[PDB]
């Protein structure tokens, strides 16, 4: 078995290679060094400065440059002992700086060791290249092993979650967050792969359908972006259900924040959702015409980015898969026709060209596109038409038709296309749950795959939402950690409420006084309100009045929020519209009556076609509240997915790119946090082992251990605070271990 077999791929690909030497001796060297910046402008850069002279206060050190400087002792980023280079859990490090953390991540990454623990977290750095560690053979090795037993790995956290479920009869959760392209979705699929293996139907029908859902969701909710060729344009919470026996009984999927806008617009080089391209590459020459299908270059919705294909991707071939998956989960052939018809029609509606000329309102000179949409949708063109350009509107009394100009007409068409697509996605999800979900379930393991904090060039309503969710998840973490401590130091014999996250949280979601969303909702009821009134109202209530808010020196359309991960500047353009998310009623009417059986559902099912009516912000707050409650009932696990750089290249781990993520994701906080206490809390039989020699008394594997522990401390004649005697482990403060290991034989 590979765990013991230094020749196995397990050893190869998952562990830091070992030689038959054990020496605390081999390790040995005669000097002591540190972490510095060869230019304080760029601080994430650092070099190792050999300390040469010491004082009492500071420390002089030699540079890579050859030069020599001086630092404060209380400003020192002390380099851990080389022995530590590559440890599996950074919680093991003596000095817990930032460069110290990055260094260990890097040393590992240079060895292709992408997974590392950091206390509670499992850190995973995208390698941007394939690493064969996800085979069934790799699966098998993880089975039933403790975290301390095997190398860091997603499979590992998954197994721990599963045994805890079974053991504690407690539900579990895995929170997988981080930047686009960090490896969130990849890792999530592995979690499910692993679960399906260790808990499914021996070689499964359900298992396959559960497996087959992703690809259905991915064709519809995934798209190529500059950051990822297969970006998830929606968030999700996957619940894997089990019976009391521990076997998979079902599953359920919750989706969030689907990027509807992408349907009608994609940035340069980007792509619209995958399905569009698959549909047009894989339908038969015969389904096309049937759908009046042509090429992407012939569609407005697909010929604007300039990108219509992905390197290493066969849209026609990926379409088989999708269609296949639909078949497995159980989509009727006719259910499938309709899904494709919708996609097609949406493709047609974008092809509609409004012209003005005539007077002031828009007009449809050519009805080619219109007709085609109507056809495939199973709707009556003149109505659609009428609904698009001349929608009836209330004047309280007056239900009267308005004649839309070209732009207004266009936006409506767009609003229509977006509704169609989001409702469709909704339906797909429901339909899948319908098949997979269990009413009757004993336990569950839930997997949250959603982005981490979003701080772009342009931050809008959607970034606020994701950011809000992130503040809550970050608060959950901190709290959790706080608790894992409160009752627990009180386990191995150790000593000794309000969140800093609350204010930010309150600023956004508070009811009284009203926070951003409430005022946003308020402004939403007045039809005649604007981005300006809105932004005016926010500044009015929070400028110089709320500490987490900032009114810009100059911009009149943005505001800043001091988030966990730092300040984020938001722009309010279109927020009223986004909050209401309007669709002309006649449009609804047009479609409520549709030949198409799938279409009817989208407009006829209040579960699909309607919000509550609550606002988009109200609904978001609500679903965020439901999600957390659930989480609150689980034993959680945190995975931090990191991109090594912004270029999608392997072998390029950029200190700035990385640290920034470490800063924003809570990895850096937790560290410094325990940093304060007693992080190093070693095992007795574990210290005397590597440290029986540095003491003229102590021998290797003995019985009276904690006593033996006393020895070296004695021989080493150490002080009452750098260390702590705790029933099981010897708690060591920071650098205690460094210095210690830093002694002679
Ligand atoms: Mg993803």
Swiss-Prot record:
ATP binds at residues 178-185. This is Myosin-2 heavy chain. Limited proteolysis of myosin heavy chain produces 1 light meromyosin (LMM) and 1 heavy meromyosin (HMM). HMM can be further cleaved into 2 globular subfragments (S1) and 1 rod-shaped subfragment (S2). The rodlike tail sequence is highly repetitive, showing cycles of a 28-residue repeat pattern composed of 4 heptapeptides, characteristic for alpha-helical coiled coils. Phosphorylation inhibits thick filament formation and reduces the actin-activated ATPase activity. Dictyostelium myosin-2 has no K(2)EDTA ATPase activity, perhaps correlated with the absence of a Cys at the SH-1 position (688). GO terms for cellular component: actomyosin; actomyosin contractile ring; apical cortex; cell cortex; cell trailing edge; cleavage furrow; cortical actin cytoskeleton; cytoplasm. The keyword Coiled coil applies. Keywords: Actin-binding, ATP-binding, Calmodulin-binding, Coiled coil, Cytoplasm, Methylation, Motor protein, Myosin, Nucleotide-binding, Phosphoprotein. It comes from the Eukaryota. Residues 85-745 form the Myosin motor domain. Myosin is a protein that binds to actin and has ATPase activity that is activated by actin. The modification N6,N6-dimethyllysine is found at residue 129. Belongs to the TRAFAC class myosin-kinesin ATPase superfamily. Myosin family. The lineage of its organism: Eukaryota, Amoebozoa, Evosea, Eumycetozoa, Dictyostelia. Myosin-2 heavy chain is two-headed. It self-assembles into filaments. Hexamer of 2 heavy chain subunits (MHC), 2 alkali light chain subunits (MLC) and 2 regulatory light chain subunits (MLC-2). Associates with elmoA. It comes from Dictyostelium discoideum (Social amoeba). Residues 624-646, 724-738 are annotated as: Actin-binding. The chain holds residues 2 to 759 of 2116 of the full protein. Residues 29-81 form the Myosin N-terminal SH3-like domain. GO terms for biological process: actin-myosin filament sliding; aggregation involved in sorocarp development; bleb assembly; cell motility; chemotaxis; contractile actin filament bundle assembly; contractile vacuole organization; cortical actin cytoskeleton organization. It is found in: Cytoplasm, Cell cortex. The keyword ATP-binding applies. One of its GO terms (molecular function) is microfilament motor activity.
